[PDB]
């Protein structure tokens, strides 16, 4: 599934992520927007044997478990095909847990390199939420 | 499966260092996020703080900087160490993972002159 | 920091018979709410997360609703094995906070 912006940003603000540990709503939606496009089935297989799972990216060597990366920790005890999901419900529950480490989201290199820094309240401006 | 287990004295005096153990069984501590809770006489439960996989930590602010949540991955432990305890500290101490499904059986801690 | 305020304080009920406990916060945060079950000599048992999601090992007669500020925890039609305590718990911010409780018991 390929979210509108402001279909997103309504779903996430229900999934609780607006303003959660700190992070306003837009910075969610801008993540969403520059790892994945919106696109809840987005994946990418990483150097280190690893892949990035879903609207989020989530990686399979620390948070989810794809059974095909080395080194894999599991942090999310989520396997990364329900990363894969229409429902962003397993997504947003390890988000929050990756978000609740010291390193916030910076987890996120895209949101990193094009969000940290800008105005994302422009995000989910414009919305009916 | 996991398996976590409080280990540590049961009584202690006041303005001395409270610490307790928690051993992890059936993974290691470096795939989750470690927390320490406990419940005082009354029904009262207060989260004291977590270590996440980075090794940052966050701590209860009531805790007044007393306390200290360290790792030792070598012997599959984390621990609680609260500094100048007294008998408000008094209280059942139990170690559980962030997601809160894996819980230890709980120890309860007196602190008192005797 | 966040307060959550549970009401009722205590709940009587014969087996058969459905509950619902509630928890409100302090300021809205979101779906972050938690819900514990403690018995005596015990760890707390984590029932529903996230206000409404199902925890796998729990009876399906526990199910969770609410968002914003106000939360409730429903038993549909207790068991004795219900009897005990019930907590809920935010995660929106540090620290994490418990509400007082709700005992729930047989009359």
Same mark, same amino acid.
């Given at each position: 599934?390929?979210?509108?912006?402001?279909?997103?940003?309504?779903?996430? +603000?229900?999934?609780?992520?607006?303003?959660?540990?700190?992070?306003? &709503?837009?910075?969610?939606?801008?993540?969403? +927007?520059?790892?994945?496009?919106?696109?809840?089935?987005?994946?990418?297989?990483?150097?280190?044997?690893?892949?990035?799972?879903?609207?989020?990216?989530?990686?399979?060597?620390?948070?989810?478990?794809?059974?095909?990366?080395?080194?894999?920790?599991? &942090?999310?005890?989520?396997?990364?095909?329900?990363?894969?999901?229409?429902?962003?419900?397993?997504?947003?529950?390890?988000? +929050? +847990?990756?978000?609740?480490?010291?390193?916030?989201?910076?987890?996120?290199?895209?949101?990193?390199?094009?969000?940290?820094?800008?105005?994302?309240?422009?995000?989910?401006?414009?919305?009916?939420? | 499966?996991?398996?976590?287990?409080?280990?540590?004295?049961?009584?202690?005096?006041?303005?001395?260092?409270?610490?307790?153990?928690?051993?992890?069984?059936?993974?290691?501590?470096?795939?989750?996020?470690?927390?320490?809770?406990?419940?005082?006489?009354?029904?009262?439960?207060?989260?004291?703080?977590?270590?996440?996989?980075?090794?940052?930590?966050?701590?209860?602010?009531?805790?007044?900087?007393?306390?200290?949540?360290?790792?030792?991955?070598?012997?599959?432990?984390?621990?609680?160490?609260?500094?100048?305890?007294?008998?408000?500290?008094?209280?059942?101490?139990?170690?559980?993972?962030?997601?809160?499904?894996?819980?230890?059986?709980?120890?309860?801690?007196?602190?008192?002159?005797? | 920091?966040?307060?959550?305020?549970?009401?009722?304080?205590?709940?009587?009920?014969?087996?058969?018979?459905?509950?619902?406990?509630?928890?409100?916060?302090?300021?809205?945060?979101?779906?972050?709410?938690?819900?514990?079950?403690?018995?005596?000599?015990?760890?707390?048992?984590?029932?529903?997360?996230?206000?409404?999601?199902?925890?796998?090992?729990?009876?399906?007669?526990?199910?969770?609703?609410?968002?914003?500020?106000?939360?409730?925890?429903?038993?549909?039609?207790?068991?004795?094995?219900?009897?005990?305590?019930?907590?809920?718990?935010?995660?929106?911010?540090?620290?994490?906070?418990?509400?007082?409780?709700?005992?729930?018991?047989?009359?």
């Amino acid at each position: 599934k390929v979210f509108g912006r402001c279909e997103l940003a309504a779903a996430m +603000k229900r999934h609780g992520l607006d303003n959660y540990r700190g992070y306003s &709503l837009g910075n969610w939606v801008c993540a969403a +927007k520059f790892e994945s496009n919106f696109n809840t089935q987005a994946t990418n297989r990483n150097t280190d044997g690893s892949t990035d799972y879903g609207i989020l990216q989530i990686n399979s060597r620390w948070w989810c478990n794809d059974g095909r990366t080395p080194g894999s920790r599991n &942090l999310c005890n989520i396997p990364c095909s329900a990363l894969l999901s229409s429902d962003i419900t397993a997504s947003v529950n390890c988000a +929050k +847990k990756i978000v609740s480490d010291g390193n916030g989201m910076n987890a996120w290199v895209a949101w990193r390199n094009r969000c940290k820094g800008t105005d994302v309240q422009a995000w989910i401006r414009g919305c009916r939420l | 499966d996991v398996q976590l287990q409080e280990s540590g004295p049961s009584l202690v005096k006041p303005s001395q260092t409270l610490s307790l153990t928690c051993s992890v069984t059936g993974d290691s501590i470096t795939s989750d996020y470690w927390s320490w809770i406990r419940k005082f006489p009354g029904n009262r439960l207060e989260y004291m703080g977590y270590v996440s996989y980075s090794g940052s930590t966050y701590y209860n602010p009531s805790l007044k900087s007393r306390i200290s949540i360290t790792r030792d991955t070598s012997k599959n432990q984390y621990y609680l160490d609260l500094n100048s305890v007294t008998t408000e500290d008094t209280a059942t101490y139990y170690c559980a993972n962030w997601d809160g499904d894996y819980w230890g059986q709980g120890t309860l801690v007196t602190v008192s002159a005797a | 920091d966040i307060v959550l305020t549970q009401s009722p304080a205590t709940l009587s009920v014969t087996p058969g018979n459905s509950v619902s406990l509630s928890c409100r916060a302090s300021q809205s945060i979101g779906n972050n709410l938690h819900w514990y079950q403690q018995k005596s000599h015990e760890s707390p048992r984590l029932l529903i997360k996230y206000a409404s999601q199902s925890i796998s090992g729990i009876p399906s007669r526990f199910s969770g609703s609410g968002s914003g500020t106000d939360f409730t925890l429903s038993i549909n039609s207790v068991e004795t094995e219900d009897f005990g305590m019930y907590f809920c718990q935010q995660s929106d911010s540090w620290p994490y906070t418990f509400g007082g409780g709700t005992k729930l018991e047989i009359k």
